[PDB]
């Protein structure tokens, strides 16, 4: 494995639902590589239909710097218009993954709590969801890390 993820900091947390996601990513690259890394943030909604995922954003790194490297990935927020109203205040998942030359080799998942700003809203949620009052809390202390063996160069 030529690249390994060493660490993720979930920087702006808790955040508003519509705030971008700012993660500091630390990775190590052991040797020169021919192709790009692609880091990707995927929203995994609580909707039951198969389209419940959103690729939120992605960032390419290339040519890959050798050694230990630290950078910030700023990912666009979810498209609320693509999320059923009943699923905006809900427990959901975000996945940060990385691929090399299109081949995924690491994925980090987090559960995400989503609740209203104020008590009166939490106890009497309106039928029309007020997305501007929803606060997300990425449960950053409990990442689920999965690695996949891939061919590099």
């Amino acid at each position, epitope marked *: 494995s030529i690249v390994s993820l060493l660490g993720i*900091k*979930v*920087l*702006n*947390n*808790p*955040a*508003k639902f519509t*705030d*971008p996601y*700012e993660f*500091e990513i630390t990775f190590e690259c052991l040797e020169s590589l021919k192709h790009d890394l692609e880091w990707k943030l995927t929203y995994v909604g609580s909707s039951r239909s198969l389209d419940h995922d959103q690729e939120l954003d992605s*960032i*390419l*790194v*290339g*040519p890959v*710097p050798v050694g230990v*490297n*630290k*950078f*910030v990935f*700023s990912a666009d927020p979810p498209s609320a218009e693509l999320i059923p109203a009943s699923e905006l205040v809900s427990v959901t998942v975000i996945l940060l993954s990385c691929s090399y030359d299109g081949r995924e080799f690491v994925r980090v998942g987090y559960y995400v709590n989503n609740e209203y700003d104020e008590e009166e809203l939490r106890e009497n949620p309106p039928a029309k969801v007020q997305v501007d009052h929803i606060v997300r809390n990425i449960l*950053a202390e409990k990442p689920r890390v999965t690695r996949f063996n891939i061919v590099w160069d």
Partner: antibody
Amino acid sequence: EVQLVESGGGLVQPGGSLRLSCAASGFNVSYSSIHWVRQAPGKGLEWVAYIYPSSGYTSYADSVKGRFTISADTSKNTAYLQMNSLRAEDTAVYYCARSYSTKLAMDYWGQGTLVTVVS
Amino acid sequence: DIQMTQSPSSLSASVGDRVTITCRASQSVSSAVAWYQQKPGKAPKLLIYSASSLYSGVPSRFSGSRSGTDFTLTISSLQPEDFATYYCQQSQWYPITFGQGTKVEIKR
């Protein structure tokens, strides 16, 4: 209406300490990052440190890490830069700045406070 | 040790000129580049973020572009209030880094 009001500058002995503060108003610092950026006399901008008050995560420039500590009191909507073991080369105007939804660009800047390290 | 190499150090222009300022990142940056204006005795003001996004309230004659590691600020038609110093910034790689600045001065 967004304010970033700094305080704490002044003349200080080499090896001494100063605490700078940055009192924010018109936005919740919890959802932003707060940065310090300094400008030596007649020179350009040099990033110093940032904090995300929500998480407490911070970052420091190489030349100040271990000497400077950035912190935030969200209940007071205020950030702080504790500057220890000050050196001649720390003389500069120190700006407080806010980043929010701009991929760590700074969209609001305070007016700056001058730190002069002199014996 | 990422560098933002800003050129030129200064340039002279007239009102109405098209002005371009370039900042070359020493390694690839996807989008987190910003441009600032600073006038003597004043704090910097944000113009462009995310390489090409116009910050709210900034005049449309300001634009930003990315060409590989070249990041460019363009003022399509210089106005009198645009004589100032301009800084680029990258904020993808640790540490946040500014370019050395470009002073836009008045031709006579």
